[PDB]
Amino acid sequence: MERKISRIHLVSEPSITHFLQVSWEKTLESGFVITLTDGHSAWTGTVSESEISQEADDMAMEKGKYVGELRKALLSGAGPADVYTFNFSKESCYFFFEKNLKDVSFRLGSFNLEKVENPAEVIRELICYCLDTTAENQAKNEHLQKENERLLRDWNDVQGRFEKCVSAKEALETDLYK
Amino acid sequence: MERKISRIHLVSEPSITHFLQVSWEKTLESGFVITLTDGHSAWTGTVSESEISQEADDMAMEKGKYVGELRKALLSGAGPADVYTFNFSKESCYFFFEKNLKDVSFRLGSFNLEKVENPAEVIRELICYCLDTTAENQAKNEHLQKENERLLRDWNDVQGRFEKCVSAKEALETDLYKRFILVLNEKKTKIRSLHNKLLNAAQ
Amino acid sequence: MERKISRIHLVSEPSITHFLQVSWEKTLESGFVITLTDGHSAWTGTVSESEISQEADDMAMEKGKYVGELRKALLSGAGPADVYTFNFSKESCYFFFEKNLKDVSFRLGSFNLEKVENPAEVIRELICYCLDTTAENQAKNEHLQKENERLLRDWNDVQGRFEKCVSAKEALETDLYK
Amino acid sequence: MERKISRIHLVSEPSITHFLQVSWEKTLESGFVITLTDGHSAWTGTVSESEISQEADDMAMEKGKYVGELRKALLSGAGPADVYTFNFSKESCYFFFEKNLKDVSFRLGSFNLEKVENPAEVIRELICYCLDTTAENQAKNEHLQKENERLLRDWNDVQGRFEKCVSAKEALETDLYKRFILVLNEKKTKIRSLHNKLLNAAQ
């Protein structure tokens, strides 16, 4: 399974940074689970692959394009120009996000999130994930430097073999064969 | 500032995974702030450079070795055989940790942690910090990657330019050589044209 | 425009008191200008609202919290416990301030200050500002006392009206109506 | 000690604003120290109680009125119609000021000012002094403010307690009154019960 964690700002609470954890199986369009967090409370919701496909229809868009918008808006895939906003009512339990073109905004999606009974468990899980992840990427990068390091020392060996070659030549002619 | 995050298990709470966030400026030896979390509440404390030197003396251990111990116990820098344990009284807010040696554990250090009034902000700050870290590292990957692909190309085409130089010089030289041979010959062809027609011109 | 003038002590010159003049338009986070003075020389620098927001990020803090720290440290908003220190190199032109928690200090900010070509003009301006200000606050307080004074004399009138009321009563019954 | 700061304009330097800092102990009449500044350099001098009395006599002016003039000219206590001028020779260090009367200015006083070796400290001291003043005054505001809010409440609830007293007494009294009326009646109801059944008991 795959996930993406990102930070957003709710239109109703601009002084605080909320977080988004979105996870899916093979593809985002195959359906995904979405969790919103403020670091203490947690709200989760599910979106089936049929609700997605259905929404793309209601919007006169090709499923691919819509999914694309979903990536940009929910998996932090937005471009420098793209501007997305997010809304959530901690009473309504209704979460909706919009795209803004020149200040003219249009609904892009919306779903209901239910309050998580055990938020600290979700959060602990999120941190473990990040921990494992940072560790993996640390390794990869560490292993990648060993490789670059090898290339350099591996190259330094060629230098030496070359010098020894020249000397063998600047010699052999002048000597051995006279 | 430097910052390190890791998971630990409290002796009194073996079922719930706790997190430790250590922040410091230059070396751990200069002091450092330490935060503990269960993802719901947060406790923070500070350990000064003095307290660190004091503790190290109380164990008759040279600072270096001690700072190293703090590094292993508190920054996940512990070896596979290293057994460190952590203790925290949520009523006392006294936190001490010990290194297990010869089946017996010895207190390696301690400190007090005030309860954090606003845990959420602390957790938020941690996730913010992780996001930056994940993003920062991913980029270093991609940069190291290209730097890697770069080196690999300079190699793949060095033995390319090299084989060409030789051919070049291998050519200029052969001319230079064939010439000299020609010179050696002319100096002998004139000798015959003469010595023969010279014994004709002279005698 | 708003400003705040305060006194600090540079780690490198503890025997002398330096001064800080910080000014901003609507908000501190909207960007501000900072001037350091020793009463003779002057060093000024600017901080845009984007450098601020940027710094809060690098520090894993919410813009609001960071700005808060800036107020406490640069506009003398520190609490009794808070301890901030300030550094400046009159060669490096580099100014940096740190917060100290139990003697363990952490960088909080830093910027470059350029030497002011006409320090006495800045200083004269600062004094005019203080002058105007002291005058305003003098007025306000002076006007506020006239008000308190009015209330007291205004109240003394009620006393008299009351006495005249009683007398009218202790009379009317005993007299007029007999 | 008392201290007053103000801006003035020197006749010889109409473009640069200068500052005057006057310090004294009880009354200006007891002597006082005066400092002049352009924010770069500083000149200081002292004017004794004697010199002040001497000058006042040299003008056949009663001390009181003269001290008042010094107050207006040197402590910003000058009226809207008052025109005072100031003169300073940075080469002589002689400073004299005059009051403009009937289109002609008359010297009101003078004194010498030695150049201050360390101007910065003087300026620093002034800003330090202003900081204290701004802080001290702001506090008096806040204190006067509360003292104000206080008085306003005692009023808003006095007409409250008052309306209640009346109701209280307005009640106790009505009982006290209704009783007496009852007494007056009983003294007449007995009269009838008797006089009628008494003319029956007697006759």
UniProtKB/Swiss-Prot annotation, chains A, C:
GO cellular component: cytosol; DNA ligase IV complex; DNA-dependent protein kinase-DNA ligase 4 complex; nonhomologous end joining complex; nucleoplasm; nucleus; site of double-strand break
Outcome (variant: residue 161 to Q): In SSMED; no expression of the protein is observed; complete loss of function in DNA double-strand break repair
Effect after changing residue 69 to R: Does not affect interaction with NHEJ1/XLF
Keyword DNA repair part of the UniProt annotation: yes
PTM remark: Phosphorylations by PRKDC at the C-terminus of XRCC4 and NHEJ1/XLF are highly redundant and regulate ability of the XRCC4-NHEJ1/XLF subcomplex to bridge DNA. Phosphorylation by PRKDC does not prevent interaction with NHEJ1/XLF but disrupts ability to bridge DNA and promotes detachment from DNA. Monoubiquitinated.
Coiled-coil segments on the chain, per record: 131-165
The protein's name in its UniProt record: DNA repair protein XRCC4
Organism: Homo sapiens
Gene from which this protein is expressed: XRCC4
From Swiss-Prot, chains B, D:
Effect of residue 82 to E: In SSMED; impaired ability to repair DNA double-strand breaks
Listed result of changing residue 61 to R: Abolished interaction with NHEJ1/XLF
One Gene Ontology CC term in the entry: site of double-strand break
Effect of mutating residue 65 to E: Strongly decreased interaction with NHEJ1/XLF. Abolished interaction with NHEJ1/XLF. Abolished ability to bridge DNA. Abolished interaction with NHEJ1/XLF
Outcome of swapping residue 170 to A: Abolished DNA-binding
Post-translational modification (record): Phosphorylations by PRKDC at the C-terminus of XRCC4 and NHEJ1/XLF are highly redundant and regulate ability of the XRCC4-NHEJ1/XLF subcomplex to bridge DNA. Phosphorylation by PRKDC does not prevent interaction with NHEJ1/XLF but disrupts ability to bridge DNA and promotes detachment from DNA. Monoubiquitinated.
Coiled-coil segments on the chain, per record: 131-165, 184-203
Effect of residue 43 to R: In SSMED; impairs the protein function in DNA double-strand break repair
The organism's place on the tree of life at top rank: Eukaryota
Known outcome of mutating residue 58 to R: Abolished interaction with NHEJ1/XLF
Family to which this protein belongs: Belongs to the XRCC4-XLF family. XRCC4 subfamily.
Name the UniProt record assigns to this protein: DNA repair protein XRCC4
Gene: XRCC4
Residues of the full protein shown: 1 to 203 of 336
